[PDB]
């Protein structure tokens, strides 16, 4: 019934035990008790109290050790007290000796009586053990005796009677063993107990096929037939979670990048579901993950180019400025790459690249700031720059379809100021504005910026209204508030100057009666 492997048993034996007894008549009797469906239970009996100098031997059959170390012998017997019935002074006994002999030969006819070695004298105990074979309760005292270490192939066990009323009910022969158990996600095989009580057995078992050894696993198989302290845990491999037995793989829609104790996590947002036992959730079409970026982070989109581009020119240098991108994609690392083209010079589309050493003081390629300044550019020659937005993923991702660019001139000056501005309509809610283009353009006019600032009060933040058309209307203004309007012409070639300061007071509904 126990985890310990048995060698010899009274019930488990095939038919007869095959035990050699000396003498045959008047010695050990085959008094067996039958209490099973057509199957008997073997028991040896001897009771020669009246006869003097009684000596009865009972040797067991050949026992195959099968790689044993320490053998435990459990004997269940009935011992009749010498007080129960009157007898002869110093004749009756209440003890029986236990003998053992090691041999190599399998089948033997006779074993030498004097050659046997005694283990210990077995006697009765006060506490009776309750163990029954049939329906009625039987109270027989049990005794356990250990012997070891054994070097030979097998051994023989002998029972000696010195004139006592005894019956050997159950004879169990078994060795203690450490069972096959899986602890700390590592397999441990069946190991036999040590030869000494003060000696421990070092057991090192191999880990699961779908798991990697992080720490060396070891267990100590004690003399009792069980492990003591577990040292070293085997962590589950990437794409496999913790389970009762072996490391179970991650289900459809789960991933595990590194060997961690935590279970399989669900796919991050905007990521395609992979098959059972995946390392990392792959990104679907339109989304791509960076090499330097962690597996825990979700899939990101490619960046967008900044729509607005402001350019100011000097005699030999050019200054560029742009706003933040529209679609970020989902990454904090946004850089800008400036590309020289020299396509501005000449009417045809095809041109030669900037082979010469163009110097730009802030950064060469991949600037984090939204402002850049290009120097040492040749005068009288037309140029064009392509400010291409670069993300952390954009390298792995395909080259972005479009990049916002602006064509500029070197030697040509900045635009002049507007000669005069005029108000067309004057009402309590809106004031219309009209203006002409400046006297000297010095380039193609692209935008007109208008500034508004309140008078008689503290300086409020300037109102910005961008209109390419030569006419604009003000909106949402309080009555009786005088306002100064300033227009500024803006080109790709440069920055314009402030216009005529027009002081117009907001119209009011009449109140004076004549």
Curated annotation (Swiss-Prot):
GO biological process entries: adherens junction organization; adult walking behavior; axon guidance; cell adhesion; cellular response to amyloid-beta; cochlea development; corticospinal tract morphogenesis; ephrin receptor signaling pathway
CC annotations in GO: adherens junction; axon; axon terminus; axonal growth cone; cell surface; cytoplasm; dendrite; dendritic shaft
Residue spans, topological domain Extracellular: 1-514
Annotated EC: 2.7.10.1
Tissue and organ expression note: Ubiquitous.
Enzyme class: transferase
Glycosylation site residues: 209, 314, 382
Coiled coil region boundaries: none
GO MF annotation, one: protein tyrosine kinase binding
UniProt keywords, alphabetically: ATP-binding, Cell adhesion, Cell junction, Cell membrane, Cell projection, Developmental protein, Endosome, Glycoprotein, Kinase, Membrane, Neurogenesis, Nucleotide-binding, Phosphoprotein, Postsynaptic cell membrane, Receptor, Repeat, Signal, Synapse, Transferase, Transmembrane, Transmembrane helix, Tyrosine-protein kinase
This protein's name: Ephrin type-A receptor 4
Organism: Homo sapiens (Human)
Classification lineage: Eukaryota, Metazoa, Chordata, Craniata, Vertebrata
